[PDB]
Structures are given as structure tokens and as C-alpha cells.
């Protein structure tokens, strides 16, 4: 399918093409113009990698966590979310609530880290 | 019991703006500054994807306009600056073989010009058009735009050929191409595809008519921000090109005048043979059928039984009232009144042109360039791919609509080529609920 | 327009300092001018002695009068003096105080102020001196 | 003996043209303007030609000057009886930093 | 608390708030070139720290365990006053000279771990 | 039993320096380049933190100094170079409606200027101050910058208004703000807080006095390296500002002279009405009270029973001996001898004479001047004095009296009084500590 | 041993020196040149880290994969690989198969992620 | 069964080109802008590895050439431009204590020059050489650059001393230093080492003789791209240095002329001593033994029993026929016909030298720099560490070989220093099979 070819497909089918999308993320005034975008892509990729690393999902494209999915975010069921709509409609459905989950995963990974350290130190 | 799952590399984009880098296959557009283009570009069709486009709010036209301005400014810098030439000119009319049309169009100016030695003066003469000189206050003349700035002589090694250009998005960005036919530039597109680089876009500078552009898919398309608003320009795209042959019968001669150490001024010598007026051919049958197609397409927007009439330019300077050309090094300004002169109810056209050396192409005050003359008779062959029409306002006084050519914005020439593309920001992060819970 | 008069001693004994005084009337000691002294003996041509600048205190003298002549300028009363120490019998000549214009304007809008275009326009009436007992 | 070589005397009848030459070096004539002066016995000298081609005020049209590199000359067209005087050629010497007069051509 | 809020607090309470600092670590118009140089330097520092964490076997972990024993020559103090009476600043002051030795010991300890895991994984 | 654990993101900082970036809400300083500043500046107080600061060893003042000089040089680049203006000037004194104080200060010059056509000149005239011309021996004059360096003319479209700019630290760095009151130039600060950007600092260029600066929180502060050194300048900060009003009632007129193709020289036209010397007014009561407070602080630093005496500038250039202003477009040079003239033991206003110069060398550089074009209308400059730059003499072993004179010669002292609360540090997120946390196979 | 000291040595012994090689991976004429070189080095390191991340070997110097390595790429036995051949000759030999191996590892990691999500789902 | 494994950080490198930043311990080359070099340069000796090197295909030579040209062009920009000097120069010969060899080399010119005031001019005198002065009227002369390009006066405060600079590769790249003797520049090297920065490369500009270069370790080395090709220059490296003493006993005087507002023109005021021709002294004993070693190494490649002759330059420009170099600031052009004049089978050499001020560096047209005069007696000591020879063919070679000096481009001069360096791109990713199966 190539890069971004699974955009119109279902979320379940597009979950198998996450590798082709992740690998595509990386006189004087013209050199500066080019260098600005060249470094901007680096900061965007590093910011995404840092956000994934603080979530305990570093190096994993599909990493499920322990934060419970609130029913107020979406009352929609699983059977018509994965193999019925695309990722674009899903982004347009939880755009307001994205920051809430992004903030919740922070303390959830932090508590997991403290608890792992305490349980290993007790042993 | 549901839990959120983090997904990376999710195929989701968002509309944004960025600085797209150039790409391409002795040029004013700096072909060396652009990276080599991909010989096999990727054309990935995005099935079941419907994305909204907007050719009027697109930032690609503004970015390419800024890029073209920067490239032209950086291209005029490495060659001779003509400040020594703002002197007094003792001109006279050249009547040596002048047809009655080109009478008074060419002036035979003489002036005291500097030389390699700062303590010596050199008396030379050159041929200047009437539009390039103005009376100082009947024999004393002064070059035009001398009181506004100092024009820079164009680099002879640098050519003005409009080579195709390619715009590519950087990492983390994508260019969405709308492959759907009958696209009016706005609204959702049912056939969107992604490309790493755009097609070969020709940065041809023209006014009131699009030249060397991309033809339509199947029929003439009428594009405007608001059809009912007469203050907005109407961009028309042709489906079949209209051949147009331009030439100037004057056998220009170039004279190298050393105005200083390492600086030479390319003047115009005596014309070999008879002096004729620069004109341009346009087929009457093809232009009539193209105007008929344009009228038929305009009737779909303005309704039937409407008297569509075409008129010439209302007024203004020569940059917006005449059609601007650039091929070979000479800038033309043709009277397009012979084309837009018809009324619609329910062998070749000749357009007189004028040559101007000192010009203000980007309508900027304080920047100008002197186009040096080129040897021999030149021939310019191209085809018309579109027009930039304007409509006159009216409070429903009658059922007659008058269409006139327009301009005043150089971005409208490239807007007819950048309407199929759009830049978006790739968002690889995504969250969705699934039955997962990490094991401690 | 501008008159220059000079006065001095007509008879001067040998071996002392000879002082000459010249004054300007109708003009001023300023501008692009060179106030010089020229003398000529009977049977010999005109011989230059020295000069003094009008807008500066610099001065130049003839090499034939090496460390023997001195020229002063007093712009307060618009007068310039000439002093010749150890006068010999070969100094009997008619001394003339002249003004040398050094201003020149070419065909263009430039101007020159240097000794290249030096020319003595006016001359004094001339005062004779005698070196004897 | 000295700079600004000039002939000691010149003799020529009236109504015709006479020329008085004056040559020097590169530092005096080659790079500086030559001036001509006329002197009569009993009075002060007067400037005749300055800047190698300009005539002074009150000087008749008969006097004319010219310069050709190292050599310079003074032309007296249509010689008259009152032209019997001593003509001196003077210029500035950049090598010695001083004004120098000619030997004096007795007409 | 916000950025650097746990600076004056003890080490025990400063450990729960490391994630905020973690997300906070990341002439032709002088301001533009200076901002570009600053961005490149910040990216280089962040990548250097991430690489140093990656070669130690603690990639993507703010708090991680190691297998290097704490030498008694580094500090003759126990955990009762370090995590409950001492902050991070003073602690950095005393072990500033021993930082290189600790880094070298943690860097070499990963090689034995990778070789041992590869051997035990190969025998399976 | 103890294993060295690795922690990332620890609150540890290290003193260093870096290249900070500006932030603002065209001007000479190009605030249009400074990135935007958020309307909610974050300021987190750091309890139990004692950080040592240093005003003289701070690198922010040097970086800001270089940035201001670079912005000034970059702003003067697209303007008109006044190279053909260096010609022979025939000037005469302006005795039309002049006063006794302005006799000979303003000169009416006439010269041959170039036109748009290279083959012809024009006869124009303009008015120049006495400080801008020098005789070459009516009389022939010449500009003072002709024999040193031909400089450009300041663009009238670009203003010299010192709008505030915020200096921000990049990622991985932080700015420590010392909120402790009664804090001098050095020493530890018991109240340190962090900020992503500094406060609004106006780049006001002034000599011997501080204008439109930051006021003290509780009392007048005396800052110096040590009072035992006379060569070190004394920085004073006021707690209550005193109003200062500078003006010129000449009502100048601007004349445009096209000296070439696309370039013009803004000359000075005829004066409207009477000509009066430019002056500046300072309230007598407020200045006396401020001098009393400064005397009290100086006595606290130098010991009691000291005769604190204030004297004017000793000597030197006009930039170091007079107070330099910059408001509207004209640069002033006011004689501050009337303010620093008192002796302390145990509706009236002070009128200070002032002079105006067009060609200046404000950065104390030889070879790069700037021509300030005249502006029309009466200039009304209203500001407040927030500090002084004093210098103490020797005085020998006689400790019964000390003489204080205004100082200058260094523009960095003006910005040092504003950057005394900030410092740049390097965040060190890597840390090691022993814990019973060990890896398991 | 320093940087690239174990280059000429055979494999096995050069495997314990991967830490010394990975550490060095990170207007005036020299200014813009140094800035461009720094950005180029940063991008090269980020590309290598991205490849290791999509392969599932992030943070591991010696990573193992569940991909079969048959004799089609090389017919020599395992003994002479590590005890007789160096890394340079190995690169000169496998360059022809390197690209297909990268894609195979990427697809294998994607499949491993999908089965890991499924195994955690029915658990 | 074998399974693939992933290894990161393997010692694998590939040949590539990069932008090597410099390293260095007021100057043309801008040493202050370079980063500080390492006080202890680490050099890791690589054992059991053989790397193929190529002296002629090294990109570092071209990169260094572009860098030196860029620094040279940037150093001349902040100082005085001598456009006002193209005027009619009334010149004459000096003839004051000349020595017959310098009869017409020095000339005393006079011309009209501007002053601080734009409307005031003045007459000044200056001493100009015959090399940079051409007659315009067949006593009136002019500068040779008046019809080519206006020269830029070199900044007097900036020195021309070639201080060494170190080229360092960025992260992810390494520089391989071949520490093997008897290397001809091409082919494999059995002893290489990894260095983060190269040694001190002095950017010495010299023609026909490699001055202040690196000496050989064991014996005289002769390197060429093709021995049998006459079009390829032969590079010779000496194992022992040949001392050369060049001087200028004229004792010139420098005076400043106000060329304009804020700029001054430094001209040769007067001579306060006997005018003598510049010369260089080379001992004939060391030169004879050096030529003996060179002819032995030449016979090692061209066979035995053949005679080898050394002739001077064939012809052409003064920059390629004479040994051009910089000594204390002044540019010399010495005639080396006395050095290459012999015939091999089976005291001091005084070389006449000339000094030129208007020069065109890097063999460019349209860019020149005027070297200001330096007061006092200039004397310098240099080391002749190599030559650039050129060979010519003949009918069946006639058992003879003629070698002439070669005035090639500046790339060949700097190639003799970067012969033992190459840039490689580190590839830390590698795959290898191991009996290891990842768990699921
Ligand atoms: C520096 O510049 C000086 C001027 O600024 C140069 O000196 C002058 O050079 C010019 C030529 O450039 C000479 O002019 C010559 O004059 C006569 C003819 O002039 C006479 O005749 C015309 C009518 O025919 C009349 O109008 C004039 O008044 C004269 O009576 C001929 O020989 C030539 O054609 C030429 O025009 C000046 O004579 C000469 N001297 C002076 C004192 O003006 C000078 O050469 C320059 N110096 C250097 C070192 O380059
Ligand atoms: C600035 O204030 C600090 C902090 O008070 C001074 O440093 C020390 O201050 C203590 C308490 O006042 C004194 O006992 C010490 O003697 C001070 N140390 C030194 C080295 O002087 C510091 O001196 C003050 N600086 C000035 C110029 O007054
Ligand atoms: C740390 O090393 C420094 C460097 O000399 C030394 O001053 C200090 O005493 C050492 N020890 C401690 C505990 O800080
Ligand atoms: C053997 O390797 C080749 C690569 O040349 C690959 O195409 C093929 O699938 C492999 N076969 C097996 C059974 O692994």
C-alpha cells in the first residue's frame, strides 16, 4: 500500500501498517530555510519519542496501558470502532479529550515505576 | 472494563503550514540550489479518503511567491549595477525605416558615459524606447525610474527560461493531491492521493492570460472565491491550448560599453534592415471556439439567457492593461483588446506589442532591472492555457455581464497550478480502547 | 582691487639680519594663496626665496638659502615678514612680495588646492637694498 | 647650472611670430603647470600666461602659451616694439619643494 | 509542582516529580540563527543523555535498577539521611568527582549482562 | 546491599552560559524577530533554595551587549550611506532670532550636492550644529566624520523607541530569579525562583544616569564590586523615581534633498520662530530627597560622620561628561553639573543646559558613526530617573570626606542594573544514588 | 582499546567493544559548516535509533530476533563466521541481502506486536 | 538452524564525503572562528586491517580548496576597495642608485587622486612596478587590472602567515591515517590508524616548489596519477629539507594617501637605500645531493641506464613559469632556471626574483587584490620539501627524459599534505546469524 495508504481503511486494518508510517517521519538563506525544516522534523520526532518514553511504551508501536477508558469519552462499542471507521474520524471524535488521556498516562506510568521500585526493594 | 491503548505511526494528518524545500531535474531560479528530484516519484492513491481543499487559503502560493522573489533578488546581485547611466540624454527620433506604427517608439539617445579610467569620459549613443525615457525639461531626456531607484543590468550568463520546479514536503509532512476531475478548487475531494513531490510547475510570469500552464482534464473550469462577488478575480483554465506565435522583426544589435573596471553596459546599436512593430499572432478560429467554451461554462454559473460580453482593460498602468511576456530576454506588453471584443446572445488576430527594458515586474518601488538587448530576430512560440478575468459590478440593471481581463496579483498565475496540492501535518500518535492491561 | 605695499631698509651693513615687511590692502591673509618673496639682482634673473601658507603655518624655502632665511606671518594686522640672517654682498637685489594663487577648477565639479597650479598674480612695488659700508 | 633651461636671448623682427622654448624635467614641467612672467627694467614683473593655457587679465591676444610634456613654450604672434623685455618661465618642482624661475629670455 | 519545584525538597519527595523535568528538557536576523543554534544544542544534549541511558540498559525508564554494587569509598552515609534529609544539589556536590567512575562502571556492566543473557538464551 | 541506581530528571543545575533568544509582544532591535511571549509567564518559587549570584561575572550582560550592537549594525545596513555629503561647506552663523545661549551653536551651511543625474550638481543649504562641523582653515567647514569614517543616515521610518524585550533560555536551561530584597551585586540569595523568560527590559542607552529602568523594592541600593576600589563604578538604584523633562523649543523643519537615484538626504530647514537652547528640568525637592537617601546609604557603606560631597564630571569626551538622551530621534547631551553639586554634613526645578548632536558614536567605536536626521515639531521628552552611575575619587588617607562624581565609558552598566536578578544554569537530569533496587535475570 | 580498535580483529572479541563505538556517534565559513555537520550526525543517529526501535531492539546493543537465517545468504558454517571472519568482510559479503533482512525484521516485529496485543487481549 | 541477530556499534565503515570542520590551537583563514583543538590528539592504531587509499580521488583536497578560496574572499571584504585608482598615471623610471638588473622594473608614477572631500582632488606620487603597470598611450600608463576588475586592497592589520589548521570529521565519521611508509598515494595501505583530526596543514601557497611542507619518513617519495602519462603532474616529496633564503633589501617606505572618507591607500613612498633586485639563495651542495636522490627515485620508475635532464619552465604566464610564493607579506615571482639546469647519466644558487603587487590569486579572472607595501627589509627562511615536475614525450623516448617544473593549480600543493588521509562513514548497524531464538 505504501506510505499513508491505509488512511481510508479501517483502524483494525491500518494497525498492521504502522511501520511504513513511522519510518517516514525522519545561497545562505536557502540553506538556513532547509536546515530549519530539517531540524524541525528532528524536534517533532524527538518530542513524540519522549512522550512515548514517559508512557512506558518506548520502542513499541502498539503498547497497551493500564489507564481505564472512561465511558464519557466515547459510548461507542468495540465492534464498530475497529473494523467500521477510519483513524481520521476517530481523531475527530476524541480531539478534545486527547490531552486528558495524555496527562493521565503520565501519573499512571509514574505510579507503576514507584510501585515496581518499592516491590523490588522489599524483596 | 475498557482501557486506552497507545498507537504510534497512525495514518492521521492535520492541515498546517511549513517551508517546503525545492527540487529539480546558469538559471535565474537557481537550479543548483535545489536537490535532485526523484526520477520515479511515488503516486499512492488513498482510497476511501475525502479531504477538503482550498486553493485561495493555501500557503503554497505565498511560499512560492516569497521563494521566487528571493531567487530573483539573489540572481540580480552578482552582475553589473547601472548607476552610472542615470545621466542626461540628448535623444532624437529614429526615422530610418520606421513604419508609421513604430514612429516615436524608438529614441536615439546620446550621452557622456564613464570608462575604465576615472579621469576620462566616453561619448556613446544607444537606442531606447519611448517608455524607457522621459523628458527632463525637447532634446534632453532622462531614463525612466531614475528618481525612484537604480536599475541593475541583467546577468547575460543567467537565462530567463522558466524551467519546471518541484516542491517536496520535509519529513513528518505530506502533500495531498486531488485527482478528482471537475474540481472547482473548493469543497471536498473524493479522490485524494499523496505525493512526496509536486509535478513540474512552470513559474511563467504573465498578466491577464496564463501561458505554458497545465491544461484541464476534460473541460473548461471556472474558479473564483465568490462568483457573485465582482471584486474577486476569475481564474479560467482551458482544456485545449490556444497556439500563440510572438516575434519582433527588429534586427537588434548589441554594443558592449565598458562603463568601468570589469563592468560593461550592453547598449542597442543601429537596427539592421527595416524597423517593424513587434506583434503576435493568435488564431481566430481556435480563439473563437475557446471563447465559446468559456461562455458555455460561464452560463452554468450565471444562468442561461445572459448576454456574456467581453471587453478590454478598463485602465491603469501598462503592467495591468497589457499582457506581460518573458521569452528570450525581451519583455513584451501586447494590446489584448483584439481578443476580448465580442458579444454572445443566448485568419489570425494580430496584437500590437510594446517593448520595455526598465521594468517593475513584482510591482515593487525601489527595485528594477534593465533587460539588455539580444542579437538577431527572436521568435516566441507558446500556447495559452488560461485567463484571469474580472467582472464589472452591477445592481441587476440588465441581463448583460461584461468580463474584462485583470491582474494586480502575481500569485494568481501559480494558483492555477498549485490548486491540486495541500500540505498537512502527520500525526503518528493515536489512542484507542482495547481489552489490555499491563502485567506488573 | 588688492594692493600690496612693502617697506624696509635701503642700506644695510654686511653680516647682520635683514628684515623685510610687506602688507596687504584691500584683501586678507586667507584663502588658497601662497605669500612668497622673489628677488632679482642686476644682470641675473628672478630668484625665488621662500613662501608661507595663508591657511596654515607651514613654510618652504629655496635650497640656495639653506638655514639662512626665515619668513613669519601675522594674520592679526594682515602682514607677513621676511628675515635674512648674515647678509652678504651678493644679496643686493630688488625684493618683491607676491601672492601666489593655488586654486584651480577643472572641467568637472572638482577643485585643486596645491602648489601644482601656483601662479603669482599680483606683485609688490619693489624695494631695493644695498649691502655696503 | 640650474633647472628650467631657457635660452639667454632671442632676436626677431616685428609683425611676425616668435617662439620662446623652456624645458625642464618630469618633476617640474611634466607634473606641474608652467607660468610665464614679463619683466621690464625699473618695474615689477607681471604674470602673462598661467595654467599653461590661460591668459591673465589685461594681456593682449598676441600672447599664447602651450606645454608638451617635458618642454613648454610661449608664442608671441605679431611681434611689436614694446615687446622687448625679459620673459621668465616658472613652475613648481616637486623634487626640491620649491618654485623655480627660468634663466630669462631677453627679447 | 511545576518546573524545578522539587529542587529544595528532600530526595524522597523529589523522586515522584521527575517526569515534569523529563518533559521539560526538550548573521541573517541574529535571533533566528541564535534560536537555531540553541535548538540544535538542546537536541544534542537530550540525545547525549538518552544515549548514555540507553547504553546502561535503562532506555525509556526514569528510575531503573543496576547490578553495580555501591562502593564504600563513594560515600560513608546510609539511606536514612540521604532520602529523608538530603536534596539532590548537595548530593551532586560530594559525588561530582566520583561521577566518571560510576558512569564507567555502569557502562561496562551492560556488556556482561548482554553476553550472559545471550548465552542463557542460546542454550534454551 | 546497596546498588547505584540511575535517576533521570533530577532537579540539579550547573552554572554556565549559553545563547539566549529574545521574545517580544519596525524597530532598530527587530522585536519583529524576537519570538512572541506568552501572556502568562510561568514563575515557580523554589523553597529552601540558596543560590549564589554574581552581577559582574554574569554572562547575560555581555550577550545582550553584543546583541544590541549587532541589531544596531544590522538596522543601519539597508539605509542611505552619506558618502557624498563630505564636501566643502561654506557656513555662516545663524543670528536670526537667536538667544545668548545659542550664539554660534547652530551654523547655516551651504554646499554643492549631487542630483539624481550624474552629470549635474545642485546648490542646496542646510543647518548643522557646531559639534557636527569643524573648520578646515564666511569660512570653509567640514563634517567631523569626513576624516574618520563616512557613515549612513538613520532611516526615519525606523524608530528608536526602546520597547521591552524578554530574554528566554532554550530547552535544557533555566533562568533563576532572585526575589530576595536588600540583595547587593554578589552573595547568596535565600529567595530564588525560576522563570522561562526575564522581565521587560527596555534597552535604553544613557550615560551617568539610568532612565526608564527598574525601581528598587524597598530602599536605595548601592552596588559595586567593593567600596575600597575607586576604579570600579558605583551603581545606584532608586526606590522612588523622580520625573525629568527634556525638550527643545526650536520647532525644527525637515527638508528632503535627493542626492542620488533612490536615495535622499533629510536636511534641516529654516527654524520657525525664536531659537532657544535645549534644556532639561528636574524637580529640586525630589532630587534633594533622593540625594539624601543616596547619602544615607553611602554613609551606611562608608561609615558614619563622613562628609559626602557630590561633584560634576571631571573631564573627557562629551559622551562621558554629559547625559545622553534618545527620544523621538534627536540625541541630547545635557550638562548635569547642576544636579551633582552639594555637600552633606553629619515648584522650583533645576534647569540643566543641553546640547544636540546629529553625528554620533554612541557605541564608543572609531570608524562607524550614524547620522540622525532631524524631525519636525517640538520634542517633549518625559521620563523618570531610576538610577545613577557614580565614581569615587582617591581622597588619600583623609576619610572625613568622600567625593562622588558621575561615571560612564561602559554601556554594559546600564543593562547590568536590570539583569541583576537573573542567572543562566545548565539542567543536569542525570543522577546516581544507592538503593536496594537491583536487576533480576 | 579505543575507537575502531577491534575493526581488524575477528568477531566475538569485537562484540564486547560495541560501547566504545556507539559513544562517538554523537556568518563564517566554519559556523554554518559545523552546524550542518552536527545536524547531519544527529539525523544519522536518529535514523539508526528509529530502525532499532521499529525492529524491537531499542536500547539493546546485541539484540536477537525470531527470523530464520538460511544458507541462501551465505553457505559457510558458524565457526568460521565468528572465529575466522571480521566485520568488514561480512559487510562486503552480506550487502546484497542487507535490505531484504531489514524489511523482514520490520515485518516480524509488527507481527510480534500484533500477537502480543492479542495474547494480552484474551488473557 | 540459525537465526539472524542485530548488532549495534560494529566497527564497519564505508567511503563517503562530508563537511569536515577544522581545529586550531586578524588572520585570512580565520583561525579564531575554528574550534579549539584537542591538547592530546588521540590516535588509535588499527591492527590487522588494510584500507585502499586514493590520493587523486580524495574529496578533502577539493573541500580544502573551496574552503581556502572562501576564506580568502571573506577576508578581503571588510577593508578598502581600490576603485578610484584607475586613472591616467604620468609615470617615469626611478634611475636613482639602480643596479642595471633593475633598470625599468621600478617606476615613479604620478596621478590625480581624490581626498576626504568629495569635491576636492589632489596630486600624489607612488612607486609602481612594471609588472602591474601597462602603457595606455603609445609616459602615460595605467594599472593592468583597469580593463579586468577593480582590485581590493588587502587589510593591513590582517597577516598572511600560513598558520596550521586541523581538519576534523564530525560525529559518525572517521579519518583513516595511513602510517605505512613507501606509499605512492594509490593502492592498499597495510598500516592505518583512526584519528579524530589531521595534523597541522599549513595553507602555504607556492608554485613549482612545495614550501614549508611535510618531509618524508625514510626516503624521497615520487607520486603521480600515471607515470606513463605526460599530462599528469609528478609530485616529489623530500626526506630532508632544502633551506632557501629569500630577501628584499630595498627598504621600502609606506605612506598613507587619503583615497576617500574613512579609507586610505597605502603606496610605496620612497627608497632610502640602494635599489637591488630580490633574490633567493639555495646551496648547490644540498640541491645537488637532493637532485641525485630525486634522479635515483626517477630511475627506479623509468628504468636504469637512461639519462635524465632537468630544464626550466616551458612558457606561459608569470605565475606558472616563475616560483610564486608569499614571504612576509609581499608576493615574489622568482626565476628558477638556475635550479633545474643539469643532465644526469648512468656557494649558493642565486635565483633572480621579481615582486608584483596587483595579483590574481587562485588563477581567477575578475577578482584581484592589491598587496600593500611593507616598510623595512623583508627576509624569510623556508624549507623546500617538494617539487611539481612535468614530463614530455619523444620519439621512442631516445633513452632520455626531460623534467620541467609544473605550475599547476593549488589543489596539487595541498594534496602533498592530505595524501595519508581519507574520510569514511561509520555504519554501526550489522546483522549476523547466531543460534538464538527470541521468546514470544
Ligand atoms: C590632473 O588633472 C589636471 C586637471 O584637473 C590635468 O592638467 C590639465 O590637463 C588638461 C587635459 O586633461 C590640459 O588641457 C589641455 O589644454 C590644451 C588646450 O587648452 C587651451 O585651448 C582651449 C581652446 O582650444 C582653451 O579653452 C583653453 O583655455 C586653453 O587655452 C591642449 O593642450 C589639450 O587639448 C588639453 O585640453 C591642461 O592644460 C592641464 N593643465 C592645467 C593646469 O589645467 C593634469 O594633467 C592631471 N595630472 C595628472 C598627474 O594626471
Ligand atoms: C554583598 O553581600 C554579600 C552577602 O552579605 C557580602 O558577602 C559577605 O557578607 C557577609 C555578611 O554581610 C560578610 O560578613 C562577609 O564579609 C562578606 N564577604 C565578603 C568577601 O565581603 C558581600 O561582601 C557584599 N558585597 C559588597 C560589595 O558589599
Ligand atoms: C572532589 O574532587 C575535588 C577536585 O579536587 C576535590 O576538591 C574534592 O575534595 C573532592 N571530594 C569531595 C567529597 O567533594
Ligand atoms: C532462504 O533465503 C532466501 C533469501 O535468498 C529467502 O527468499 C527464502 O525465503 C529463505 N528460505 C527459508 C526456508 O527460510
Residue numbers in the entry:
A (entry chain B), G (entry chain F): 520 to 545, 568 to 664
B (entry chain A): 33 to 57, 66 to 141, 150 to 185, 188 to 309, 312 to 323, 323A, 324 to 396, 405, ...
C (entry chain H): 1 to 35, 35A, 36 to 52, 52A, 53 to 82, 82A, 82B, 82C, ...
D (entry chain L): 1 to 9, 11 to 27, 27A, 27B, 28 to 95, 95A, 95B, 96 to 104
E (entry chain J): 520 to 545, 567 to 664
F (entry chain I): 33 to 57, 66 to 136, 145 to 185, 188 to 309, 312 to 323, 323A, 324 to 397, 406, ...
H (entry chain E): 33 to 57, 66 to 140, 149 to 186, 189 to 309, 312 to 323, 323A, 324 to 396, 405, ...
Sentences from the paper on this structure:
Cryo-EM structures of 41328-a.01 and V033-a.01 in complex with BG505 DS-SOSIP revealed modes of V2 apex recognition similar to human broadly neutralizing antibodies PG9 and CH03, which utilize β-strand pairing of the V2 C-strand as a focus of trimer apex recognition. While 41328-a.01 solely bound Env with a 1:1 stoichiometry that yielded a single 3D reconstruction of 2.9-Å resolution, we obtained reconstructions for 1, 2, and 3 V033-a.01 Fab-bound Env complexes (Data S1-Fig. 10 c). 41328-a.01 and V033-a.01 Fab’s each exhibited asymmetric recognition of the trimer apex by penetrating between the N156 and N160 glycans of one protomer and binding a second N160 glycan from an adjacent protomer. The structures also revealed both lineage HCDR3s to contain an axe-like subdomain that recognized the C strand from a single protomer through parallel (41328-a.01) or antiparallel (V033-a.01) β-strand interactions. Two parallel hydrogen bonds formed between the mainchains of 41328-a.01 residue Y100fHCDR3 and Env residues 167 and 168, and four antiparallel hydrogen bonds formed between the mainchains of V033-a.01 residues F100cHCDR3 and G100aHCDR3 and Env residues 169 and 171. For 41328-a.01, a third mainchain hydrogen bond was formed between the backbone amide of Env residue 171 and the side chain of E100iHCDR3. In the 41328-a.01 complex, a string of three aromatic residues (Y100eHCDR3, Y100fHCDR3, and Y100gHCDR3) stabilized the extended aliphatic chains of Env C-strand residues K168 and K169 in an identical manner to the string of three hydrophobic residues (I100eHCDR3, F100fHCDR3, and Y100gHCDR3) utilized by CH03. 41328-a.01 further engaged the C strand through light chain residues T30LCDR1 and N31LCDR1, forming hydrogen bonds with K171 and D93 LCDR3, forming a salt bridge with K171 and a hydrogen bond with Y173; these interactions with K171 and Y173 were strikingly similar to those of CH03 mediated by heavy chain residues E30HCDR1 and N31HCDR1.
Here, we report 11 lineages of V2 apex–neutralizing antibodies from simian-human immunodeficiency virus (SHIV)-infected rhesus macaques and determine cryo-EM structures for 9. Envelope complex structures revealed eight different antibody classes (one multi-donor) and the complete repertoire of all five possible recognition topologies, recapitulating canonical human modes of apex insertion and C-strand hydrogen bonding. Despite this diversity in recognition, all rhesus–V2 apex antibodies were derived from reading frame two of the DH3-15*01 gene. On the negative side, to penetrate the apical glycan shield of Env and bind underlying conserved positively charged residues, broadly neutralizing V2 apex antibodies must contain heavy chain third complementarity-determining regions (HCDR3s) that are exceptionally long, anionic, and often tyrosine sulfated.
